[PDB]
Copies of this chain bind each other. A is one copy, B any other.
Amino acid sequence: ARNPLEAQAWALLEAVYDPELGLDVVNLGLIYDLVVEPPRAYVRMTLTTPGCPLHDSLGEAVRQALSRLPGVEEVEVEVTFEPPWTLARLSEKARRLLG
């Protein structure tokens, strides 16, 4: 799955922003795994707080972002708390202080 769509996928996700922290899911370190292999795309991610929300809007935005990739007919977005997220996963870039 080492292809140009992978790089494109990362760019797309960098445009998906978290509701609470105001930063994109990539710099926030919410993306645990990403695999793009047409016709499928898989992403394992987490949320910044424990518990499943009534509407996983962030997960939906991530799915829709990956769907923008050509040839991706199926997107599997798995939201997990293993391991549990903490601010230590923030990027240096997001540590270049927007916070």
Contact = CB atoms under 8 A, between A and B. Distances in A.
A32 to B, nearest CB: 12
Interface residues of A, number: 14
B60 A54 contact: yes
Interface stretch (A1-9, A65-73, A75-83, A85-93): A75-83
Contacts of A96: none
Interface in A17-54: 47, 50-54
Contact of A55 (B51, B54, B79, B81): B54
Nearest to A57: B54
A-B pairs, top 7 by smallest CB distance, nearest first, are A52-B52, A52-B79, A54-B56, A51-B78, A52-B56, A51-B79, A55-B55
